[PDB]
Design a binder for this molecule. Structure first.
Ligand SMILES: [Zn+2]
Ligand SMILES: [Zn+2]
Lengths: 163, 365, 365, 163
DNA sequence: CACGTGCTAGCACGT
DNA sequence: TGCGAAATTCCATGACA
DNA sequence: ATTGTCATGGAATTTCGCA
DNA sequence: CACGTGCTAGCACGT
DNA sequence: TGCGAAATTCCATGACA
DNA sequence: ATTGTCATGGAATTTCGCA
């Protein structure tokens, strides 16, 4: 097909429950398919209602052609269906139990999942407040496969906060 | 009557000779084409120019005519202007007949996140109990983020900017000297993140022009969409943010979204002319676009402009003058000439101040 | 797909031929220097221009670029502009990029008492419990009368004007459409004395320029005299009235007192160059001065001005638009072109209105 | 000397008491020496205090070189003395009991004094309200001696309200 | 609490 | 080439404070 | 120590379709 | 009482 | 006559709403 | 049925004193 580009697919997924940091028990995770750029949204529940609220912030910045996710309840509602269509995002799911993204994403959803846990019982119930910094390192992590970082890939420039 | 030798034919510099200077009623007179006028002694003259002027604190020519109604002396306007120069009321009340230096057209931020431009739109119609909006405009691209707030306070400003800087961290952030931007609390947050705070000269929104000019587009489209319908605007900011970031500036032929990303997202009428190029061949072409963008130059200086020279005496527009109060502070000295439109003055209170020449007039005489 | 004969080589007017028009995905396409764009049927086009525009109600060029991202058709901008013309929100929200016609420089009243110009300065600092001032400027001379009042009401206006017209009765009296001047009660008094009432077009103080411009001089000198002292201004009006009436306009080289009387009263620096001439030889010379007075002409029209033609569609600036509301009323028709700066419109409510072109924009398209 | 001009001398005098029209018992009378132009001021008393109040209105319009009057109390105060000097008006008086103005004024002070009385028991205690109209006719009355009216002489123009 | 900077309210008159 | 029509670009005007 | 800005739509100008 | 025309008030924030 | 200095005039800028 | 205005002070321009 044609070359992989940013916004082509946003891979989403939850992470939780976690310790109640400021009242936020989960984390909606959005990764760009091509740049590996990652957006993190603390939510109080992995629900369509809390998910929509978050992807409504994201989609006021950019809109993906396809959101790709797992078959978790939140992501397979009628609500989330109708929400997707109204915006012209195509919904796409991994076939249940046997998940599948891409190499880039598979590693990043790991990077995050580990980058989170150093902050788990390393920093008690105080992770909410540092969620943005997690995001920043995440987006400034040099890629071996592609010579660049997500922040360089997405925006096309050196970042002012490199890791 | 000291330089009185004129009656005795003696020639005193500045006094034309063809005129006969006679005496009458204990005043030296002189028959002029105007009529017969009285020549007062050099000692009296200041007292007379003062007397005449203070009638309605009339300017040069107006003050002279009054004087000419009765008297003649060598180079009247010189003695006249000297006083207009020493009249504290006229100096601080009379408007200026010099216009500012032509505007600077600052070079536009080299890359995204180089300079942010922030402001506070509102108060506005309470929609969802939110009264204000925090506008954040990237300098280079014009990408804009719109954060609804209940107050123009450090709280919400930091609260928004944290969310915003989960995406990226900007080198410098520019803003008017509004309450919440000058706050030490904000100064902190800024420094924590190693962000440089820049501030527009006071009472000079042109300097936060990028936000302000987006302030229009935001407010204009927000209006077009609340036609014949309540002013509930909260639920429309996102809509407006997308709509605007993805709207082509005809000069540049690019959307603010484009200059930030190089590629259109899943928005309507999305442009796909770089669908062939690999992301590298895409990103590369972007640094090529971001360099050759149109840039306006300084317009011609008005024929009656004025330029800030160090040590020159200037005055600062009174921020909020009361009713029937002077609009100009007492005159102050130029210390630094930052640029042809920015000046460090010895403020009247008595501080160092960085002001736009737009809030200064040069002191006349 | 109705004019589809293009795939069959048929030549349809407006469609360049060197381009091959193929089919794909059930859409007629065309390979262009831009890329490959989709040609929609003539029926769909309006629906697409509408769809594109309504994204941020973008103007001509902005709306087109969006459209060009995907489609091509003959003379795109025509279908585009046609809609901008039928969009009630843009029509009434978008500012104008045409400036007004150049100003008129009305001939100045032929003699004293020909036209009076009246206004209400204030509210101001309560001095002696008076809040306002009634300014009365003679048109021809610029002689000015200043009457302190507690309210901008018909009461005090008539009450002053009676006192004033114990001196003389004026042919016509001009004023803004302020509350007390439009009053029937005042309309009476005016007619009782066979005085003609004239009214400036609404929301257009330039038209009461003579009062307004004296409004400055009054307010400016009043200020110079309350420097470092309470704003008690009541006891200073007379002082200001004299001072001002007797202050030389440098252009004309005459005081408003002079143009009214021909001879200076017992005021300071009083001019006596007509002390020789008998009052007839004085009064005569006056009608000679009052004729040869300087008069400014209409300045050049802006390169992008606009002139009111009958039947042309124009719109009236919304007097006091709310927050986030359009600034333009719906479009209206020009009935009478009173002059190149004044227009009778079919008001939106739906009346006849006489407006300054300064509160109109020509309707685009 | 040099030709008679307006403002050269303002001849003043009172007229009263009269019927209490709206509370005004007297009338301060000012006539211009040269144009015969006349100013009328209803006052509640022929006092310097009420006189000053009136000539303070007049002198915000024009200022005479000389105010000439009779030796009536109001006009010969210290107050009225000091008031005159502050403004640079020279004060001048008729020698007591044997008054003297000019022909023009002598006739006008009559014109007024009669023009008033037609309005006396011709129009009851309602003369205050018509005082301005008295003034207007007074100033538009064709002079036999000088070919002109005061309003023509003072302002140099036809008046819009001629008699 | 008044000051500075940033903002938009509001009140009077006569119909 | 050169012409007439169409598409582009220019730009001063006004609104954001 | 800081600096005006850009959508807008008739008017001008440059480019395009076709010889 | 709200509307029109003419005017100037005023309030929020952080120090 | 023409020159240098002084006096006049021009004028765009800003403030009145 | 209505219409912009004029004090202001450096800069330009015209006039004046003296040959
Ligand atoms: Zn002064
Ligand atoms: Zn529209």
């Amino acid at each position: 097909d044609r070359p992989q580009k940013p916004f082509d697919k946003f891979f989403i997924d939850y992470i939780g429950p976690l310790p109640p940091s400021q009242g936020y028990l989960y984390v909606l995770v959005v990764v760009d398919g091509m740049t590996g750029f990652t957006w993190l949204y603390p939510t109080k529940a992995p629900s369509t209602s809390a998910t929509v609220k978050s992807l409504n912030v994201l989609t006021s910045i950019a809109i993906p052609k396809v959101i790709h996710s797992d078959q978790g309840a939140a992501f397979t509602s009628s609500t989330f269906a109708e929400w997707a269509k109204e915006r012209g995002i195509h919904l796409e799911f991994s076939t249940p139990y046997h998940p599948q993204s891409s190499g880039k994403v598979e590693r990043k959803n790991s990077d995050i999942k580990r980058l989170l846990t150093k902050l788990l019982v390393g920093r008690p119930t105080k992770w909410y407040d540092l969620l943005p910094v997690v995001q920043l390192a995440l987006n400034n992590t040099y890629s071996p496969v592609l010579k660049y970082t997500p922040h360089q890939l997405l925006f096309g420039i050196d970042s002012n906060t490199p890791f | 009557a000291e330089l009185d030798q004129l009656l005795q034919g003696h020639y005193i510099k500045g006094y034309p000779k063809q005129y006969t200077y006679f005496l009458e009623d204990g005043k030296v007179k002189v028959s002029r084409p105007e009529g017969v006028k009285i020549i007062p002694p050099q000692s009296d003259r200041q007292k007379i120019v003062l007397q005449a002027h203070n009638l309605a604190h009339t300017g040069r020519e107006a003050t002279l005519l009054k004087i000419a109604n009765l008297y003649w002396w060598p180079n009247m306007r010189k003695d006249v202007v000297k006083q207009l120069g020493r009249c504290q009321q006229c100096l601080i009340t009379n408007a200026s007949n010099k216009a500012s230096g032509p505007i600077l057209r600052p070079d536009r931020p080299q890359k995204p996140f180089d300079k942010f431009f922030i402001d506070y739109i509102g108060p506005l119609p309470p929609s969802q109990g939110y009264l204000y909006v925090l506008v954040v405009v990237d300098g280079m691209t014009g990408f804009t983020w719109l954060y609804p707030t209940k107050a123009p306070s450090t709280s919400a400003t930091v609260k928004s900017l944290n969310v915003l800087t989960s995406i990226a961290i900007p080198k410098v952030i520019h803003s008017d000297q509004g309450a919440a931007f000058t706050s030490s609390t904000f100064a902190e947050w800024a420094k924590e993140r190693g962000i440089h705070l820049e501030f527009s000269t006071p009472y000079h929104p042109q300097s936060s022009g990028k936000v302000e000019r987006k302030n229009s587009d935001i407010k204009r489209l927000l209006t077009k969409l609340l036609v014949g319908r309540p002013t509930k605007w909260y639920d429309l900011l996102p809509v407006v943010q997308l709509a605007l970031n993805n709207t082509y500036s005809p000069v540049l032929k690019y959307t603010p979204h484009q200059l930030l990303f190089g590629i259109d997202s899943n928005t309507p009428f999305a442009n796909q002319d770089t669908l062939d190029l690999t992301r590298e061949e895409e990103l590369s072409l972007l640094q090529e676009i971001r360099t050759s963008l149109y840039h306006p130059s300084t317009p011609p200086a008005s024929s009656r402009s004025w330029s800030p020279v160090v040590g020159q005496l200037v005055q600062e527009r009174v921020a909020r003058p009361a009713s029937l109060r002077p609009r100009w502070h007492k005159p102050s000295t130029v210390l630094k000439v930052l640029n042809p439109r920015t000046v460090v003055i010895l403020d009247h209170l008595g501080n160092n101040r960085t002001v736009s020449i737009d809030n200064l007039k040069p002191t006349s005489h």
